[PDB]
């Protein structure tokens, strides 16, 4: 019977200088056997805190940890630019050791609506037998957005995939692709291909669409 570690929120946005708190709940008591790790993209985790609140050697003192029952918190007292990263908690009260799923600390900026573009499949692709329809959401903030595909006004489900960039290194926005993949046969069964986008930066949902052929 393992002990689960549940981290919330999955991500949060903050600015340099903010006080940041990250929380993790053990499914049952782990006494005081919790560690916190920092991981940057493409890099190995580093130990920050062990035994709930003890700083590991060399870790800056703006990092601290505390416990309230099964709730464990990592606090960064004044967030520095090198602190944008993902943070993981882990218990070692009982084997097997288990990790929380992580909290990504991201850069806060002003709201930015996406610019939306839709791309029909190329004739090259159609000749090969497939039809990818691409909808682009460019340079928006915050990350949350809802992308809906409609084919002849019928809402699509299960036949699309999304991909989202990491925060731009220059302007801190996100960009996102949603790709609707039909067979050539299915794509020719319909006329209107529409991508509908909801985002905080938009007063009402934006729809880009095209008519097959035209």
């Amino acid at each position: 019977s393992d002990i689960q570690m549940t981290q919330s929120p999955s991500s949060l946005s903050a600015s340099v200088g903010d006080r940041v708190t990250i929380t993790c709940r053990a499914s049952q008591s782990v006494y005081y056997s919790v560690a916190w790790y920092q991981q940057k993209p493409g890099k190995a985790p580093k130990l920050l805190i062990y035994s709930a609140s003890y700083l590991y050697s060399g870790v800056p003192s703006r990092f601290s940890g505390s416990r309230s029952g099964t709730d464990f918190t990592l606090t960064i007292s004044s967030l520095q630019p090198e602190d944008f990263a993902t943070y993981y908690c882990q218990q070692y009260r009982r084997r097997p050791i288990t990790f929380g799923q992580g909290t990504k600390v991201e850069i806060k900026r002003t709201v930015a609506a996406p610019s939306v573009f839709i791309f029909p499949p190329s004739d090259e692709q159609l000749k090969s037998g497939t039809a990818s329809v691409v909808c682009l959401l460019n340079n928006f903030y915050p990350r949350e957005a809802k992308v809906q595909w409609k084919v002849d006004n019928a809402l699509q489900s299960g036949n699309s995939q999304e991909s989202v960039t990491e925060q731009d290194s220059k302007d801190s926005t996100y960009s996102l692709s949603s790709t609707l993949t039909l067979s050539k046969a299915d794509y020719e069964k319909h006329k209107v291909y529409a991508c509908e986008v909801t985002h905080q930066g938009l007063s009402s949902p934006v729809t880009k669409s095209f008519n097959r052929g035209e």
């Binding site: 610019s115 791309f119 692709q125 090969s128 990818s132 691409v134 682009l136 880009k208």
Partner: peptide, 25 residues
Amino acid sequence: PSVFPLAPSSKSTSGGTAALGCLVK
């Protein structure tokens, strides 16, 4: 990969900005 164009059309110009790309499939 098969590489297909994501072409700009005259329809989709937003504020002096066009988008184009490549689908790498």
